[PDB]
Design a protein around this motif. Structure first.
Motif, PDB file in Angstrom:
ATOM      1  N   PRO A   3      44.222  49.722  42.458  1.00  0.00           N
ATOM      2  CA  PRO A   3      44.540  49.646  44.108  1.00  0.00           C
ATOM      3  C   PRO A   3      44.711  50.989  44.588  1.00  0.00           C
ATOM      4  CG  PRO A   3      46.670  49.240  42.892  1.00  0.00           C
ATOM      5  CD  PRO A   3      45.473  49.277  41.784  1.00  0.00           C
ATOM      6  N   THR A   4      44.634  52.236  44.050  1.00  0.00           N
ATOM      7  CA  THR A   4      44.622  53.414  44.600  1.00  0.00           C
ATOM      8  C   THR A   4      43.121  53.708  45.051  1.00  0.00           C
ATOM      9  OG1 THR A   4      46.401  53.829  43.240  1.00  0.00           O
ATOM     10  CG2 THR A   4      45.573  55.773  44.478  1.00  0.00           C
ATOM     11  N   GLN A  10      36.478  49.605  45.184  1.00  0.00           N
ATOM     12  CA  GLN A  10      37.269  48.521  45.085  1.00  0.00           C
ATOM     13  C   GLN A  10      36.330  47.223  44.607  1.00  0.00           C
ATOM     14  OE1 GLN A  10      39.253  47.485  48.692  1.00  0.00           O
ATOM     15  NE2 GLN A  10      40.565  49.339  48.543  1.00  0.00           N
ATOM     16  N   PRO A  25      12.104  14.518  41.610  1.00  0.00           N
ATOM     17  CA  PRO A  25      12.804  13.758  42.679  1.00  0.00           C
ATOM     18  C   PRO A  25      14.154  14.618  43.416  1.00  0.00           C
ATOM     19  CG  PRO A  25      12.480  12.478  40.845  1.00  0.00           C
ATOM     20  CD  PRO A  25      12.234  13.601  40.380  1.00  0.00           C
TER      21      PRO A  25
END
Ligand SMILES: *[C@@H]1O[C@H](CO)[C@@H](O)[C@H](O)[C@H]1NC(C)=O
Lengths: 49, 108, 125, 44
Positions: A3-4, A10, A25
């Motif tokens: 997350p940093t 990210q 078809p």
């Protein structure tokens, strides 16, 4: 991955949809629009194409 | 480390007022905050995940905002079933899932 | 609509052990993470432990490291929490939360909760 | 398009194909593009 991490590092989930046309078809179609029925009046009817 | 603070503790309002509650963090968390509605008689429920994203199935009366270090939750209508205790949680720092203190909300 | 029912609560003497269970039936249990949240009688919520979708990554709260051992059983759709060496400061209320993602330490929060079970650590009848 | 027509009627004949008339109604319509040249039946 962490997350940093910055915006450019990210994780980004990616899904790619491929559409094919070939001698077979047709199976997949978009939803078909429908309208309310009108009786006893001169109308232009589209019944199943 | 990280510290989580609650500016308000007890608030008073009516059926037709507007209430805002603010949550402050010691360090930047980059919009990673969550708000929970804890009824005293049942299991607590989540209202807002992320900074300003509203969870599905809850009324749109609750509205959250803010980013960086200071955050705030706003309620627009104050229906009389909205009495509970609200907590703000961070999910960004090394101390996992830190909860702030309670914020009692009574209507009078 | 998901159900999370707990049991095993009661009263034990200090230093004794007790086990908890939490059964989930309203969703798919084999690919979500779960946590345990403690609520003091006169304080706010506090995180305790958490497990991944599969038992690979497990983390514990600082005040309960070396005492609590969380488990998981994907076959019977239930998780357990073995509480060992209890002291006088663990007389709180315990919930069985559900994580939104699949890992333990993610920005995702706790999505569904369940009614708490009451435990007590004291010397009484 | 693979089409199948079916009809089920009673008959008292044993060792002969009955003499009569009976139309066959459509049953299903399979939209699969197979180039087919051979087949085989099943027994139980
Ligand atoms: C039909 O399929 C067969 C394979 O059995 C192939 O030999 C033939 O060329 C195909 N015909 C067409 C028109 O594609």
């Amino acid at each position: 991955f962490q997350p940093t991490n910055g915006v450019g590092y990210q994780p980004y989930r990616v899904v790619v949809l491929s559409f094919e046309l070939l001698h077979a078809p047709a199976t997949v179609c978009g939803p078909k629009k429908s309208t309310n029925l009108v009786k006893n009046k001169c109308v232009n009817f589209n019944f199943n194409g | 480390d990280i510290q989580m603070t609650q500016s308000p503790s007890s608030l008073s309002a009516s059926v037709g007022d507007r209430v805002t509650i603010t949550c402050r963090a010691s360090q930047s968390i980059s919009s990673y905050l969550n708000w929970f509605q804890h009824k005293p008689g049942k299991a607590p429920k989540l209202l807002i995940y992320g900074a300003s994203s509203l969870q599905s199935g809850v009324p749109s009366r609750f509205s959250g905002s803010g980013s960086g270090t200071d955050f705030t939750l706003t309620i627009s209508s104050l229906q009389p079933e909205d009495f509970a205790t609200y907590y703000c949680q961070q999910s960004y720092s090394t101390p996992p899932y830190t909860f702030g203190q309670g914020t009692k909300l009574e209507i009078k | 609509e998901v159900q999370l029912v707990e049991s095993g609560g009661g009263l034990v003497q200090p230093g004794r052990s007790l086990r908890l269970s939490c059964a989930a039936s309203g969703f798919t249990f084999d690919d979500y993470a779960m946590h345990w949240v403690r609520q003091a009688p006169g304080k706010g919520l506090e995180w305790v432990s958490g497990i991944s979708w599969n038992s690979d990554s497990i983390d514990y709260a600082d005040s309960v490291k070396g005492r609590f051992t969380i488990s998981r059983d994907n076959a019977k759709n239930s998780l357990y929490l073995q509480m060992n060496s209890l002291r006088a400061e663990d007389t709180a209320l315990y919930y069985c939360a559900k994580d939104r993602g699949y890992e333990i330490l993610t920005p995702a929060s706790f999505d569904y909760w369940g009614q708490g079970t009451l435990v007590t650590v004291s010397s009484a009848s | 398009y693979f089409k199948i027509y079916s009809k089920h009627t009673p008959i008292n004949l044993v060792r002969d194909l009955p003499q009569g008339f009976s139309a066959l109604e459509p049953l299903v319509d399979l939209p699969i593009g197979i180039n087919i040249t051979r087949f085989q039946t099943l027994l139980a």
